[PDB]
Amino acid sequence: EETIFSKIIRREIPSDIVYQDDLVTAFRDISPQAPTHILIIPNILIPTVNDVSAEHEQALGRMITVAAKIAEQEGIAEDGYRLIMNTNRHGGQEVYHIAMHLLGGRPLGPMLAH
Amino acid sequence: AEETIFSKIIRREIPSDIVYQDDLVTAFRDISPQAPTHILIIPNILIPTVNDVSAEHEQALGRMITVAAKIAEQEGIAEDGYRLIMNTNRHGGQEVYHIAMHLLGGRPLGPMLAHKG
Ligand SMILES: Nc1nc2c(ncn2[C@@H]2O[C@H](COP(=O)(O)O)[C@@H](O)[C@H]2O)c(=O)[nH]1
Ligand SMILES: Nc1nc2c(ncn2[C@@H]2O[C@H](COP(=O)(O)O)[C@@H](O)[C@H]2O)c(=O)[nH]1
């Protein structure tokens, strides 16, 4: 059940890719929600965070280490930012290939609508 | 940087109720829960901010997520769904300078950002 994210990874549909290595691809979100909104995803199809196992841990860590790098080069590192992963209906997960959202460029919070 | 109370939680130097701990990570309930499940997963090493992460941390960072997934399932929220959030510095609203992943769930969580601008 490949999603559009695998075609993005493979440069078979256009996207603004900001970083890629053998574990991870990062690209700008097509419907951004903050001045910076970048997605960082594993190059392998893992549909939900429920599907992760210990073998994925390096790629999972790289997603965070890559978001940090990207936060710096976006000029958002000092003022700050948020990283978010959504899972299933309560999380609002829309694409079934795991993704960390990097959000920033302005004060962001609260974590959840009250 | 100096240690936060989380260090004393991890080291069991302070009274606590740890939900999970291994070589790499520790998890415990937030003191001010923002959802029916609100559990923090943190590395056992002081990393003040996400800006302080390096390659050598990638295994512990990955463990934070595989552990979040394990806890979400133990909590009965894995199928319904959940959010993992990490906050950094002022714009993220980071209150404690030891990195933490928030596992939030137990209800429909609303928009990913309530202030959507
Ligand atoms: N660049 C790009 N972004 C997408 C595409 N499809 C979805 N997105 C973005 O990625 C997010 C999907 O992550 P999820 O909703 O699964 O957490 C959505 O917020 C959406 O804005 C796409 O085909 N191209
Ligand atoms: N159990 C517990 N939770 C705390 C303590 N101090 C802060 N917290 C929770 O952990 C979060 C700190 O993470 P941050 O705000 O840095 O993302 C806060 O939202 C707060 O609710 C504490 O001493 N004990």
Side-chain angles (χ1 to χ4, degrees), chain A residues 18-94:
Chain A
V18 312
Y19 176 104
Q20 353 92 64
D21 64 22
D22 18 54
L23 323 91
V24 131
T25 309
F27 57 96
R28 289 188 191 278
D29 195 290
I30 206 178
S31 174
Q33 296 185 39
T36 303
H37 190 171
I38 172 181
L39 305 177
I40 309 107
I41 76 178
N43 294 345
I44 187 53
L45 177 50
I46 303 160
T48 210
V49 55
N50 295 328
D51 305 302
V52 72
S53 78
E55 214 60 30
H56 308 316
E57 281 173 351
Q58 164 167 231
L60 293 175
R62 178 68 46 82
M63 291 163 219
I64 295 178
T65 245
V66 173
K69 178 139 38 276
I70 293 169
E72 177 138 1
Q73 54 201 27
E74 287 276 297
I76 162 210
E78 193 173 7
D79 280 343
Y81 51 93
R82 194 165 286 146
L83 301 172
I84 304 170
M85 300 186 77
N86 313 299
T87 299
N88 285 347
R89 50 179 9 167
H90 281 14
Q93 187 176 353
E94 291 176 1

Side-chain angles (χ1 to χ4, degrees), chain B residues 55-72:
Chain B
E56 65 169 7
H57 303 133
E58 290 178 342
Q59 207 98 115
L61 297 163
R63 186 63 51 76
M64 292 167 59
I65 298 169
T66 65
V67 166
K70 281 205 155 185
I71 302 177

